[PDB]
């Protein structure tokens, strides 16, 4: 229950070795503009803007491509594959390299990279070049910003009341709703309806669920902008690729926040994807061992990326082999591979503390690719808004 670990360590990706050559600069292309961007060939990821993506590139063609990007814009395209086998992709996200390190260990040139999602895009065309490396003709998808739902109606005499400044939080939210949505009486709907489409109210409702996962402040950790908050929450929601792609396709932060709240309330169980009916854990065991939330992307020693969701308890898992601290994503913990007891598919790893004074003494790191969010009782699947 108590976290006697340094929450800032997994975000640093300290397992990638010595300090990388950090970049300060930031690049952004105009909305709706068309850009040709290189795609990394073995990256099988669906990246969210604001999400950190660590990589280890081994192939000389991949290493060359990154050396060129580091000198130029530092931006590559991360395709959201609808069909991974036939490499089909209609959407994706740009990724900007913010840290890198080249190593000629043993006698093999390998490059470790830390990138971040920046802009969503629509794939216009894909062509593999005579070198074997492919380029994507892309169109930068704009982020739909809507004004206050009350802006259209709003009485000009109440415009000066739209800025709002120990005491009872429920009484505060009651006053917030009465003042922000007073002009709802000029329309066909009540104040309480407009609250369901209000960024600050939706963000406060999400914060109430995020507080159940992390014992950390809104003040620092969480962003203020609905766009950034909605993407930060999307990055740490353990959902399957079909749902994540639909979530990514949403252009409005209001619809994204509403959609996330609905997933967070409906999907309370997490099953094995191959079994579909083997419960591994529930949302009540989810907890944040990293500042970015319960789930983040990490890279293994062979470049394989795993979005790892940390939980207190997991069931229906077999442990393969003995624990190892080799390349551990949670410094101070040893990992043991964990499979589903029914289908034997890899679900994640069990992390066990190296010192007695550490807390928690054990937890599980589950790979998102192996999980399936489930809604118990007598209902199948749906993502409203």
């Amino acid at each position: 229950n108590i976290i006697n670990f340094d929450t800032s360590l997994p975000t640093s990706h300290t397992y990638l070795g010595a300090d990388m050559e950090e970049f300060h600069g930031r690049t952004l292309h105009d909305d709706d503009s068309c850009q040709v961007i290189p795609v990394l060939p073995q990256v099988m990821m669906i990246l969210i803007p604001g999400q950190t993506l660590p990589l280890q590139l081994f192939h000389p063609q991949e290493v060359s491509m990154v050396r060129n990007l580091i000198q130029k814009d530092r931006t590559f395209a991360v395709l959201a594959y609808s069909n991974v086998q036939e490499r089909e992709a209609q959407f994706g996200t740009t990724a900007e390299i913010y840290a890198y390190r080249e190593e000629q260990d043993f006698g093999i040139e390998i490059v470790k990279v830390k990138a971040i999602g920046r802009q969503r895009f629509k794939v216009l065309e894909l062509r593999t070049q005579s070198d074997g490396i492919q380029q994507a003709k892309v169109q930068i998808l704009p982020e739909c910003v809507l004004p206050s739902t009350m802006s259209a109606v709003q009485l000009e005499s109440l415009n000066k009341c739209q800025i709002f400044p120990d005491q009872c939080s429920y009484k505060w939210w009651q006053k917030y709703q009465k003042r922000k949505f007073h002009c709802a009486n000029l329309t066909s709907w009540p104040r309480w309806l407009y609250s369901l489409y209000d960024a600050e109210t939706l963000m406060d409702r999400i914060k109430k669920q995020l507080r159940e996962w992390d014992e950390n402040l809104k003040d620092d950790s969480l962003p203020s902008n609905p766009i950034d908050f909605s993407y930060r929450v999307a990055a740490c929601l353990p959902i399957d690729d079909v749902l994540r792609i639909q979530l990514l396709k949403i252009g409005s932060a209001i619809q994204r926040l509403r959609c996330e709240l609905d997933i967070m309330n409906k999907c309370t169980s997490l099953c094995c994807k191959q079994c579909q009916e083997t419960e591994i854990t529930t949302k009540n065991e989810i907890f944040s061992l990293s500042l970015c939330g319960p789930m983040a992307a990490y890279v293994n020693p062979h470049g394989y990326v795993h979005e790892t969701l940390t939980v207190y308890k997991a069931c229906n898992l077999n442990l393969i082999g003995r624990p190892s601290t080799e390349h551990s994503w949670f410094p101070g913990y040893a990992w043991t591979v964990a499979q589903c007891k029914i289908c034997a598919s890899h679900i994640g790893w069990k992390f066990t503390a190296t010192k007695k004074d550490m807390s928690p003494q054990k937890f599980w790191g589950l790979t998102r690719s192996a999980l399936l969010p489930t809604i118990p009782d007598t209902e199948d699947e749906i993502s409203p808004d």
Partner: protein, 796 residues
């Protein structure tokens, strides 16, 4: 691909602004009133108000201020529209000809800018050296007032205070000085800045910020000889002139927030203040007279004068007469009666001016005979609530005051009455329970009833179903709903094989802790033999946002579900089928076996009932994020909606398209900037019943404007579209605003030209133009065009 025609039946009646000055003549006192896209000019006579001129603008009036620059014989008028069209107008009359000539004009929009939260602010310097505008946060636009600035060129000054609440130019300053209330993490403060026209920047203001009231919202610049500024909040009215500071926290103002003001005395000794509940106060700054220092200000006072309509803007005219501009109720001319008890109040009404806004719902009814239809609206809100019966004579309007908010309305021909959902505010008692604020329709019914349960000073909303006689408009019955029950939808119809006509209400249980409603009811009532009874009651797991009679059945929307009920022989609702949607089913409209489901974010969905399977099937959808206020089915293939930044749009289905992706996609075929906010779409007409127009959809808006939409043929549309471009070359726009620019579909992120819509108001203005101008328009045949336009005027 759609060919639609939109025309105004009733101009907006809600008042968003009013100013006094000497605009028509240096000797005349004028009252200028802004009613959205309309400007009314009055001469304030000893009698009352003498109408002088009324003009229309190709914009929504956002700023309206009079000013007399150096030399000018009389005042000029600055106007800024919601699409940022700025202009300086002059009244000029030469014999018979009245012309509001445009002295200067230009668009002041910036390519880059976050439109401010506190909206547009437009202030003019007391010496008329410049116009200050706060359109975007972090910038203050300055239009220098020179005779050689006929294009209205402006520069911005960077403003580090990003959250400005209100700003005014101060009096008595050597340099033009702005005084403003702003908010930052630390709280609310009042700052000042000098405005250098030479350096095009701000310089250190004459006095300090201080941590003023947390709810300080209004700045009032006090004229000479006192100077300084008054800052009004929720609890306090404070004065600031740097070193001089005076504060008061009158308990009389604590009941409601003060939201408008007006100077009575030119010296700034007396001010009128209005609150959100119609109270009118007098603020007096007591000028004390010492021996040397004869200009002292000993104290501030507030006196409750009386009650007026809920005021959007006040203006003192003369001889105690005050014009009350109202958005929620009728506007008034009140006489501030000189020191008079009159059982408490000092304010006496002189005139009342009709305001249909906001029109939150309406219905058409044949009523007398049948031929000519009558429109019955749910107008006003709170004590200003009423029903308005609009018929063609000009439009003749009958008013029925309810003293509470009418919300929904439907007519029941069989019982010769209307069903009206209403709500009233009751305050919680310290003693226990709730007390009404005034007698209203729901507390003054002939007969009354309350629902049976199947489950401090805080304001509580009590919901009711009123039965109102169609002839007398008397409240025959009032049924009160359960505690925390919110009445959302109302229908009058016959269901199944039942010959009886019922009033069906759809509700939601609203609790502060719950964000999304998990309970609601569909209650079936019968009003028969002069009494209301509850026939049946169905509890549902959500809010019943909308309901429609669907081929002898009841189609109701519970949250994201759309459910079809059948009325059994046991007089009970039986769930036939459900349809679980990707969106919240707020809007529901039906034509035959087709259903139109929509949400507040313009997610449009089309469903069809499959009778041979007994279930629903999705036909098509279109999700473009934008706020949507109303929807309607024009015909089998076209859907009309009202979306953000006062636009109309039309979506079309194409059941013939080659692929199944195309035929389950709705094409946006019409876009138009209406300039009004539509709340209700309603099929019907106000004219008596082989026509160039097909169909008739009336609509009610927030500003009390009533419009009409009808469909045309491709030939009729192509002709009238060319006619518009020809009429624009000959017609004179106030402020020199482009018609094409005004009607262009507008959101802040995008502006597209209007498509699939004919501005009937522009087409009809052909009949008002002179014979030489008429011949200029028809130069490709003039009297044949007069027949076409006269035929188009007959639809309203």
């Amino acid at each position: 691909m759609s060919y639609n025609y939109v025309v105004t039946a009733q101009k907006p009646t809600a008042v968003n602004g009013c100013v006094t000055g000497h605009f028509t003549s240096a000797e005349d006192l004028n009252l200028l009133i802004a009613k959205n896209t309309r400007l009314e000019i009055y001469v304030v006579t000893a009698e009352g108000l003498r109408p002088v001129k009324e003009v229309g603008m190709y914009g929504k009036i956002a700023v309206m201020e009079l000013f007399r620059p150096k030399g000018e014989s009389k005042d000029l008028l600055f106007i800024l529209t919601a699409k940022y069209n700025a202009c300086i107008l002059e009244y000029k009359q030469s014999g018979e000809s009245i012309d509001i000539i445009t002295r200067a004009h230009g668009n002041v929009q910036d390519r880059i800018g976050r439109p401010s939260e506190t909206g547009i602010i437009g202030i003019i310097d007391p010496e008329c050296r410049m116009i200050g505008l706060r359109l975007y946060d972090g910038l203050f636009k300055v239009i220098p007032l020179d005779r050689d600035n006929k294009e209205l060129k402006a520069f911005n000054i960077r403003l580090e205070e990003l959250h400005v609440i209100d700003v005014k130019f101060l009096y008595g300053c050597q340099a033009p000085t702005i005084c403003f209330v702003y908010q930052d993490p630390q709280g609310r403060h009042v700052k000042t800045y000098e405005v250098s026209l030479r350096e095009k920047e701000f310089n250190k203001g004459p006095w300090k910020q201080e941590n003023v009231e947390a709810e300080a919202s209004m700045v009032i610049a006090v004229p000479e000889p006192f100077g300084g500024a008054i800052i009004i909040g929720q609890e306090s009215i404070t004065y600031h002139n740097g070193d001089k500071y005076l504060a008061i926290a009158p308990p009389i103002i604590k009941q409601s927030t003060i939201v408008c003001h007006n100077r009575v005395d030119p010296n700034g000794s007396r001010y009128l203040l209005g609150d959100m509940e119609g109270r009118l106060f007098m603020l007096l700054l007591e000028k004390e007279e010492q021996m040397d220092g004869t200009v002292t200000l000993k104290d501030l006072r507030v006196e409750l004068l009386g009650e007026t309509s809920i005021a959007e803007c006040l203006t003192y005219l003369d001889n105690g007469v005050v014009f009350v501009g109202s958005r929620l109720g009728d506007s008034q001319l009140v006489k501030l009666n000189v020191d008079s008890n009159e059982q408490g109040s000092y304010v006496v009404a002189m005139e009342t001016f009709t305001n249909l806004g906001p029109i939150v719902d309406m219905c058409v009814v044949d009523l007398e005979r049948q031929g000519q239809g009558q429109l019955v609206t749910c107008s006003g809100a709170f004590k200003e609530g009423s029903l308005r019966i609009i018929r063609n004579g000009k439009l003749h309007i009958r008013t029925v005051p309810l003293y509470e908010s009418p919300r929904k309305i439907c007519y029941q021909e069989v019982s010769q009455c209307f069903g009206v959902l209403s709500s009233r505010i009751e305050v919680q008692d310290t003693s226990g329970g709730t007390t009404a604020l005034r007698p209203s329709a729901s507390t003054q019914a002939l007969s009354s009833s309350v629902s049976s349960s199947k489950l401090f000073g805080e304001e509580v909303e009590v919901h009711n179903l009123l039965i109102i006689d169609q002839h007398t408009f008397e409240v025959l019955h009032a049924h009160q709903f359960l505690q925390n029950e919110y009445a959302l939808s109302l229908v009058s119809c016959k269901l199944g094989k039942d010959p009886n006509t019922y009033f069906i209400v759809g509700t939601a249980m609203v609790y502060p802790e719950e964000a999304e409603p998990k309970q609601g009811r569909i209650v079936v009532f019968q009003y028969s033999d002069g009494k209301l009874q509850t026939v049946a009651e169905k509890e549902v797991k959500g809010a019943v946002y909308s309901m429609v009679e669907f081929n002898g059945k009841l189609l109701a929307s519970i949250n994201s579900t759309v459910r079809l009920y059948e009325w059994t022989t046991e007089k009970e609702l039986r769930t036939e089928c459900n349809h679980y949607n990707n969106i919240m089913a707020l809007y529901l409209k039906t034509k035959g076996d087709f259903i139109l489901v929509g949400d507040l974010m313009r997610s449009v969905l089309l469903l069809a009932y499959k009778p041979m399977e007994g279930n629903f099937e999705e036909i098509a959808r279109d999700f473009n994020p934008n706020w949507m206020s109303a929807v309607e089915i024009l015909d089998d293939d076209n859907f009309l909606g009202a979306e953000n930044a006062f636009n109309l749009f039309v979506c079309q289905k194409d059941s013939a398209a080659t692929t199944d992706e195309e035929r389950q996609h709705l094409q946006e075929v019409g876009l138009f900037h209406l300039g009004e906010f539509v709340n209700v779409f309603c099929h019907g007409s106000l004219v008596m019943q082989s026509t160039p127009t097909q169909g008739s959809v009336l609509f009610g808006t927030v500003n009390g404007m009533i419009g009409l939409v009808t469909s045309l043929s491709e030939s009729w549309y192509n002709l009238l579209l060319d006619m518009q471009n020809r009429l624009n070359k000959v017609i004179k726009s106030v402020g020199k605003i482009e018609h094409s620019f005004w009607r262009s579909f507008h959101t802040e992120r995008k502006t597209e030209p209007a498509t699939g819509f004919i501005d009937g108001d522009l087409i009809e203005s052909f009949l008002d133009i002179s014979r030489p101008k008429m011949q200029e328009v028809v130069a490709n045949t003039a009297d044949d065009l007069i027949k076409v336009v006269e035929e188009l005027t007959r639809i309203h």
